[PDB]
Structures are given as structure tokens and as C-alpha cells.
Write a protein that binds this ligand. Structure first.
Ligand SMILES: Cc1cc2nc3c(=O)[nH]c(=O)nc-3n(C[C@H](O)[C@H](O)[C@H](O)COP(=O)(O)O)c2cc1C
Length: 168
């Protein structure tokens, strides 16, 4: 079973996290795709996906994901299991915390993808997020700006969860 992890990054934090996620899964189970360089239609090449995106400029997708968002309408994610992760800043942007993964999950689910890897809100403080579904985040949310001391344990916990939900 091959997992494709597709990310965008401006300041490198989501990329750093992507690499830890890859390591934590082990071997060559996860292949990384930076959408500054990767073709978006490679999303079709996997039945198991991990979508990484930080939120920028008070509620916007990271620029690589923003530029490719319209192309999601052309893809069929039916039959795929999709997980999400984001980096964000809950102190600076409490009204838009992790919006970007929420935006992406809404569209990918509309295009047939099935979300796995929902994540508790416990231990975050924010006002609003477009990433909430029935009181859980759509996926792992990291905050390297305020909570960098929690990132490693959070990733370990989530990868264990994903191994179960993906049926590895
Ligand atoms: C100008 C600016 C705007 C930001 N806007 C948001 C936001 O709306 N929501 C959020 O959750 N985080 C926001 N952040 C936090 C970034 O998402 C966070 O620093 C993230 O780790 C950046 O990921 P990257 O290094 O992969 O680009 C913002 C950061 C900056 C500096």
C-alpha cells in the first residue's frame, strides 16, 4: 500500500512536518510531493493520500495549493482514503486557525474522497476554524509558532492512528 503525501509550504514548516510524517510511517510507504514542482494529477496515482497545507494571510490556502485548487474539480477521489494535516498559528490567527485544510477537505470530499484521521480539539485555543467537523479537526493540526514542543508527539500519535484507519 502506497501513500502519497502532497503538500505546499511558504516557510518550510509544513515540509519539515511532511518529512517527519514520512519517517514515522517508515521505509518507502509515504512518497512526498511538493506542489511547487509536482503535477497535481499525481493525486490520482494513490488510493491513500495525505494532504498538507498551512493557512496564510488570514484564511487563505498556501499559494501552491491556492493556484491548483480549481483543478481538484477535474479529479475523481472516489474510493480513496484521505488524511489532512496543517501547520498554523492559533495565537496570531485565532479567527482563521487551520482554515486551509478545512477548505481542501470540503472540496476533496465533494469530489468523492473519504476523510480519515480526525483529530481532537483538546489543547488548542482559537476562535474559529473551517477545519471542524462534528467537533473534531479534519486532521492533524500542528503549531510550530506556539506549540513546537508538542509537534513530535502529535505526529507519532497521529501516524499510529492513520496506520489503523488506512488499514495498513
Ligand atoms: C502573515 C501570516 C499569516 C498567517 N495566517 C494564518 C492563518 O490565517 N491561519 C493560521 O492557522 N495560521 C496562519 N499563519 C501561520 C502559518 O500558517 C504558520 O506559520 C505555518 O507554520 C506556516 O507553514 P509553512 O512554513 O509550511 O508555510 C500565518 C502566518 C503568517 C506569518
Amino acid at each position: 500500500k502506497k501513500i502519497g503525501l502532497f503538500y505546499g509550504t511558504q516557510t518550510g514548516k509544513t515540509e519539515s512536518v511532511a518529512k517527519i510524517i514520512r519517517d514515522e510511517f517508515g521505509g518507502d510507504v509515504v512518497t512526498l510531493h511538493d506542489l511547487s514542482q509536482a503535477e497535481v494529477t499525481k493525486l490520482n496515482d494513490y488510493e491513500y493520500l495525505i494532504i498538507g497545507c498551512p493557512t496564510w494571510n488570514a484564511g487563505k490556502l498556501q499559494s501552491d495549493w491556492e493556484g491548483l485548487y480549481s483543478k481538484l474539480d477535474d479529479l475523481d477521489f472516489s474510493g480513496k482514503l484521505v488524511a489532512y494535516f496543517g501547520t498554523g498559528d492559533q495565537a496570531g490567527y485565532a479567527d482563521n486557525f487551520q482554515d486551509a485544510i478545512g477548505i481542501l477537505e470540503e472540496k476533496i470530499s465533494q469530489r468523492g474522497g473519504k476523510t480519515v484521521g480526525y483529530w481532537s480539539t483538546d489543547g488548542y485555543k482559537f476562535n474559529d476554524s473551517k477545519a471542524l467537523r462534528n467537533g473534531k479537526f479534519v486532521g492533524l493540526v500542528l503549531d510550530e509558532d506556539n506549540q513546537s514542543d508538542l509537534t513530535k508527539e502529535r505526529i507519532k500519535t497521529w501516524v499510529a492512528q492513520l496506520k489503523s484507519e488506512f488499514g495498513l
